[PDB]
Structure formats: C-alpha cells, structure tokens
C-alpha cells in the first residue's frame, strides 16, 4: 500500500511533515528534513530580521512531552526565502514557509516578497498567529478583531492560497467565533491545529526549580500532554470549515496517533516534540505504523476514514 | 514533620481534599470523604434545582487522565445546604460547599441562603466560575465582564469570605486580566486553580469512536494531561494575588505532584481524576508520600516551601 495524496495542487508521498520550529531552522536542518521520508517540510517561523531568541535553557523534554520558550530564534526571512527560491529540491517534496512577524506590517512586507516565489516555485505559506507576550493585549488568535485584521491584510498583500497556524481553543463559543473569522477569507485554504498549549509550567521536584530560563519557567507544551486538545481542535475546525483543509499537529508519537488525527479530520499530520526527541527516522516508523493499522482495518486510502470519527447516538 | 495548615479560620490536618465533582454528590459520598484521611472535603457543584445531568457515558478514564461532560448532575442546593447545616460533622474536618448556578441570579439566590449557615457552622463557599452562562458565549471566567458581574453580585449577596474555582488560562494576558478582576473583590479569599482543561476530544482507535456521548465526544480533561497547565495557573495566581490563598487542583496522583503544587504556591491541594480512579485510600498514600519528600529535604512544615519554586537567573 502507499500513502500518497494531493492537496493544495501539490502531490505528497504521505501525510507526515515536521511541525514548524522542529528540525527546520538552518540550511542543515532543512536539508535533513528534505532527505527524510516525510511527505513535506515546513521552515522555522521567521521574522524580517534574524533573531537569537531567548536565553538557554529554553526547551526541555520529558516522558509526557515538552515545554519551550524559544523566543522565535531564526535566521531571518531573507534566508528562508533564498532557501525556497534557490536551494530546495521541489522534486523531493513540497515546502511550506512559516512566517511570524511581530506586527501586521511585518507580515505584509514578507508575504509581498514571497508571492512571486510561491507562483514560480510552488512554496506554500503557513502564517503563524502566535507571538511573544505584549503586556496589555492577548495573543493575536485570542483577539478576534486583531486576527481578522491580520488575515485581511495578508490576504490582500499575498493574493494566493495560504494557511494559518492556530493556537488551541478550549471553549465552544471560541471555536464558533474563530471559525467564522477564518471562513471570511477564502484564500485561507488550510488551518493547522494546534500550536503548543500556551504557558504551562514544568517544575523539577529534586531541584525545586523550573526547567526553562525564560518567562520564569512558563512555556508552550507539546507532546502527549496535548493530544486530546489537538484532536478536539482538529475536529472542531474540520466540522466548521468545510471548504478548508485542516492539518493536525499535537501529540503524534505513533501511527495510531496519526490515525486519530486523520479520523478527526486531518489532511496532513505534523510532528513536533516526538521528532525533536527521536529524530527524522521517526517518519519511516510512523508511515509503517499507519499503514499497518489501515491494513488491519481494511482501509486502502486515507479518504476512506478522514473525518469519519464516530459519535455516540 | 507536619502537614497541618491553619487558614480561613479553620484547621486542617493536611492539605488534601477531593476536587469538586468527585466523590461528593450523595450523602453516602460525603460521609465517605469525611471518613477518609483527607484534610477537607468539598460538595458537588450544585444548582437551585436537582439535575440528572447528561446522558451516559459521560465520564471516561485512561492512563493519562480523564474526560467528562457530566452536565452538572447534583441533588440540588437544598440537599447540600442541609448536609452543611445538619449532617456534616465539623469535628472531623472542614467542609466546602461548591455552587455553580446557571445564571447570576441563581447564584445570588443560593448564596443568600448559604450565608447564615456559613456564619453559624463555618461551611466555606467555593463559587464555580468555570461553567456555562448563555449558550454561544464563553464560560463565565472566560468572559471577564461576566466574571466581574458575578463577583460583584455574589460579594453583595453573601457578605462573607469565599473562594472561586477557575478554569485554566493559556495566555499571560488572561492571567493578568483575570487576576486583576479577582483582586477587585476583597471577600474572594481563595482561588482554586484549575478546573478541567475544556473541550478536549478523546478518540478510541479500535472503535474509531469518541468515548463520551454528550457534545459529540468533547469534554473537560483532567489528570496527567493537565499537571503543567495546573502548576502554571497556580503559580500565575500566586504571584498576582498576594492577598489571597491559592488552592491547587489538577494532575495530582502522588505526593510528589502535591509537592510541586505547593512549591508553585498551593495551600490546599485537591484531587479529582486520581481519586475517582483509586478511591479514598489515595489520601493516606499522598500523605505518606509527601512526608517522605519533606523528610528527604529536611522540610518540617508546608510553609517552609510553599510558593518557593526557584526560577533560573
Ligand atoms: C522547540 C519548538 C519550537 C517551535 N517553534 C515553532 C515555530 O517557530 N512556529 C510554530 O508555528 N510552532 C512552533 N512550535 C510548535 C510546534 O509546531 C507544534 O505546534 C507543537 O510543538 C505541538 O506539536 P507536538 O505535540 O508534536 O510537539 C515549536 C515547538 C517546539 C517544541
Ligand atoms: C467527573 C467529574 C466531575 C466534575 N465536576 C465538577 C464540579 O461539579 N465542579 C467543579 O468545580 N469541578 C468539577 N470537576 C473538575 C475537577 O474538580 C477538577 O478541577 C478537574 O478534574 C482537574 O483535576 P484532576 O486533574 O485531579 O482531575 C469535575 C471533574 C470530574 C472528572
Ligand atoms: O514567548 C515567546 O517569546 C514566544 C511565544 C511564541 C512565539 C512564536 C514562535 C513559537 C515558538 C517559539 O519560538 O518560542 N514556540 C512555540 O511553541 N510556538 C511558536 O509558534 C514566539 C515567541
Ligand atoms: O458543558 C457543560 O454542559 C458544562 C460544563 C461545565 C459545568 C460545570 C460543572 C463541571 C462539570 C460537569 O458537571 O460537567 N465538569 C467539570 O469538569 N467541571 C465542572 O465545573 C457544567 C456543564
């Protein structure tokens, strides 16, 4: 059996890719993801200028998952654009570029430059709504008027199909409001659910200490902690955005976990913490595992079960 | 070495108690919690009228935690008021009564009648703000104007010290706003962080099905999934509300997990999922485990380490 699929006018060998931020910051990292058996790759979220990010330690992993406050360390937009425009081998797999400007104007400036490269090479845009804390106002995707502005301005500046990386929501009225915003924008063709579960706190009992330096130890959670949160957001948006694709991200360690994301509605499945921990060999294992669960069930395609999670009565 | 605490004008043998909703709905449950080694108990969140709650299955547990959409099944306010006024033996341990009216008026009506019993018998109010108000609006504690209204009205109607049960928040801006609202109300003497992580989705791979019947399988998450989120909220509020107590709730299965809560700032420590799963014998184990960590570290009292989590530089 093979796991090959088409979307967004691209062909993918399988639905797996890295999550933005993991194994994708340097040319080395991008070449390593390209060499992997993933179906696609996404670059590190970038800003107009390079950033060193926050002080170390800024990432830690544990049996149940990870916590991070990286601070958007990246080599700057010119680097990632050059990678997309000159260095990436599109014959190997599709590329998505993640942008995370600190204002609307910065995002507009980047997407205007990306548009012709998207037209000529087929690089895909993932717009990351998460950002550093600004005292006195919420994260963009938790401020629905700010979100609507970002999407209206990016849509106008870019003019081509793109996606948006969302933080998790926890309230059905928030799902309803966020999806209504997203559905105002026909160029938003995919929604990736989810970014890390914001501002957790991991404490080491022995040392009586937080485990990351920035933000007094507060950082985004990934991994096993967040799988049911991720599945709920994937499904909520799959149900609310029938003209869009949903990409699942959060808590994938196994083909089974990927299977659940796809049942919930995921088209592509992104792997963050488990990729950081296991390395790019994980992609062959996830493919093998997903194909085994399909075989056991009699499914020959992903479309035969995508979004088909069953409810009770 | 000593687990005693003396707060809110009561004395507690140890900081452990059930989380509202677990082992606290019937007189049988309340007598069981009173018989246990817990330092306190809290009754099931109640409404003016008795409620049957949602259809079953509405709770499920797994290795990493639980999901529920119970729908506020309870025996009605009058039952819990009678338990507090006439049945509970206050010589065993202190009692908290949790109230979760479906409108501000409902809460005002209950607290008016609870007041004289609170004054005479010393039952302590926990007001649940992580609950529905109007369908299509967020839960109360996610709607800061509604939250302010509920607290103004309850403070005026009740007129005695009380506490509040908060959902988890995920954005620093929400910690900031939420704590600022709470600090407007001097009668709010304790803040219990956290209720369940809202609207997750657990899917069973073999059956391809959600595991709870209400809300298309969406429900609040408890247990191992939510410990870092719980710690973050306990510490966030600990830092922002220096004139209030913080009670920790979420992901406690062991004396080590309780130790982390207390380092974060917790006074009382509540136990939901793990208590549901293990039963009331858990309290002896948690006591023993916490005392063993204290002994190893040379801590004689809880106040020697409460709130003393270390940050890095
Ligand atoms: C070290 C690290 C860096 C990340 N950087 C980004 C990023 O630059 N942009 C982004 O959209 N998400 C970023 N994330 C979030 C992940 O893409 C992903 O949404 C999250 O980790 C949840 O997936 P997981 O459970 O597989 O880890 C980062 C995650 C980690 C652990
Ligand atoms: C079956 C069930 C019933 C619950 N009912 C209530 C409730 O009536 N009021 C309330 O404040 N919280 C309720 N909760 C939330 C718990 O009090 C607790 O905040 C949550 O489960 C997190 O703690 P844990 O990780 O120890 O489970 C309920 C939890 C469960 C599992
Ligand atoms: O708190 C910060 O300093 C902060 C928070 C989020 C971001 C956006 C980039 C990002 C990061 C990161 O670079 O810290 N980590 C994630 O889990 N998700 C992300 O989207 C960037 C910075
Ligand atoms: O979705 C609902 O119908 C809903 C959500 C929350 C409540 C309040 C009672 C409650 C419940 C409950 O009875 O479902 N479960 C929790 O995990 N925490 C709670 O505070 C009650 C009902």
């Amino acid at each position: 059996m093979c796991l090959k699929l088409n979307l967004l006018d691209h062909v993918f060998a399988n639905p797996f890719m890295n999550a933005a931020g993991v194994l994708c910051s340097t040319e080395e990292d991008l070449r390593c993801m390209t060499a992997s058996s993933s179906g696609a790759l996404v670059s590190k979220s970038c800003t107009s200028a390079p950033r060193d990010g926050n002080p170390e330690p800024r990432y830690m992993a544990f049996p149940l998952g990870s916590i991070n406050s990286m601070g958007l360390p990246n080599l700057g937009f010119d680097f990632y654009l050059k990678y997309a425009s000159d260095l990436h081998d599109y014959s190997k797999k599709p590329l998505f570029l993640s942008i995370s400007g600190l204002s609307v104007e910065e995002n507009v400036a980047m997407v205007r430059r990306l548009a012709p490269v998207a037209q000529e090479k087929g690089v895909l845009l993932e717009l990351n709504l998460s950002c550093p804390n600004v005292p006195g106002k919420p994260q963009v995707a938790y401020d629905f008027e700010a979100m609507r502005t970002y999407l209206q301005q990016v849509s106008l500046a870019y003019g081509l199909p793109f996606g948006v990386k969302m933080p998790p929501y926890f309230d059905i009225a928030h799902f309803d409001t966020a999806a209504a915003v997203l559905n105002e924008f026909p160029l938003v063709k995919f929604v990736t659910c989810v970014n890390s579960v914001g501002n957790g706190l991991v404490i080491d009992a022995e040392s009586e200490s937080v485990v990351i330096k920035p933000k007094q130890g507060f950082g985004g959670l990934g991994g096993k902690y967040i799988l049911p949160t991720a599945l709920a957001n994937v499904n909520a948006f799959y149900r609310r955005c029938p003209d869009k694709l949903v990409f699942g991200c959060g808590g994938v360690y196994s083909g089974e976990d990927a299977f659940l994301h796809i049942l919930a509605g995921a088209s592509m499945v992104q792997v963050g913490t488990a990729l950081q921990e296991e390395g790019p060999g994980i992609f062959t294992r996830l493919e093998d595992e997903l194909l085994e669960i399909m075989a056991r069930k009699g499914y020959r395609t992903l479309e035969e079960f995508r979004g088909r999670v069953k409810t009770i009565e």
Side-chain angles (χ1 to χ4, degrees), chain A:
Chain A
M1 203 162 23
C2 44
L3 297 162
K4 278 229 291 91
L5 72 172
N6 279 239
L7 45 102
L8 309 168
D9 202 35
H10 289 77
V11 186
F12 305 79
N14 63 69
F16 294 105
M17 55 187 296
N18 62 307
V22 180
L23 191 58
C24 60
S25 296
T26 64
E27 182 175 344
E28 175 192 332
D29 288 337
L30 298 165
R31 294 186 184 281
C32 179
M33 274 298 304
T34 295
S36 86
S37 71
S38 74
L41 80 165
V42 51
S43 64
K44 173 61 194 175
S45 290
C46 63
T47 50
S48 276
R51 295 169 60 95
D52 288 341
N54 291 339
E56 296 187 337
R58 62 199 184 176
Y59 171 87
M60 294 293 296
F62 306 93
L64 296 185
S66 67
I67 186 169
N68 91 79
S69 180
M70 307 304 285
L72 247 178
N74 72 98
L75 291 174
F77 174 77
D78 290 1
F79 169 81
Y80 299 101
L81 187 67
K82 170 156 248 285
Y83 183 74
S85 78
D86 299 350
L87 306 184
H88 191 248
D89 188 352
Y90 293 88
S91 75
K92 296 286 184 191
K93 63 191 75 178
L95 172 66
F96 295 81
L97 199 152
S98 177
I99 288 159
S100 196
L102 294 184
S103 62
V104 69
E105 293 86 7
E106 181 180 3
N107 283 319
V108 165
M110 288 194 272
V111 303
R112 293 186 177 293
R113 296 175 55 196
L114 184 58
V117 185
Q119 225 135 208
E120 268 215 344
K121 307 299 173 148
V123 58
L124 296 146
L125 172 58
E126 187 181 84
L127 173 69
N128 178 9
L129 300 180
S130 299
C131 61
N133 183 233
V134 179
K137 67 147 79 44
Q139 296 286 295
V140 172
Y142 290 158
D143 183 348
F144 298 114
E145 289 309 319
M147 178 173 154
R148 183 184 274 109
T149 296
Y150 274 49
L151 298 176
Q152 163 259 301
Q153 283 303 115
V154 170
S155 297
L156 187 67
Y158 193 51
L160 300 162
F162 65 104
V164 178
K165 182 70 172 286
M166 312 283 290
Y169 298 94
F170 299 92
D171 187 291
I172 300 300
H174 287 172
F175 294 145
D176 297 338
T177 302
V181 175
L182 294 167
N183 283 328
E184 296 178 28
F185 302 95
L187 293 171
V188 171
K189 294 303 302 151
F190 71 90
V191 184
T192 302
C193 291
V194 293
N195 215 310
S196 52
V197 167
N199 294 296
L201 182 65
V202 167
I203 305 173
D204 182 71
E206 170 272 309
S207 66
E208 310 180 15
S209 184
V210 306
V211 303
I212 65 165
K213 179 168 175 174
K215 298 172 51 164
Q216 294 176 120
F218 284 73
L221 308 172
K224 303 196 185 243
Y225 294 113
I226 74 159
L227 177 62
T229 296
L231 293 179
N233 275 259
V234 165
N235 193 61
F237 288 93
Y238 180 72
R239 293 176 180 275
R240 286 171 170 76
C241 302
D243 289 343
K244 301 191 197 300
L245 305 173
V246 181
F247 288 4
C249 191
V252 177
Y253 289 71
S254 71
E256 190 161 294
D257 302 331
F259 179 78
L260 298 181
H261 270 270
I262 298 168
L263 275 178
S267 284
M268 296 296 287
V269 179
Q270 309 191 333
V271 187
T273 300
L275 167 62
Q276 177 58 215
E277 291 312 298
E278 181 166 337
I282 196 170
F283 289 112
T284 58
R285 177 173 69 76
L286 294 174
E287 291 156 34
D288 286 347
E289 289 180 352
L290 175 55
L291 287 167
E292 195 70 306
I293 295 162
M294 286 172 66
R296 161 195 332 147
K297 291 172 173 283
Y299 286 130
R300 296 187 288 148
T301 69
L302 304 172
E303 174 227 312
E304 271 163 9
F305 67 97
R306 180 183 301 113
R308 293 207 91 209
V309 59
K310 299 173 193 191
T311 59
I312 304 169
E313 339 195 27

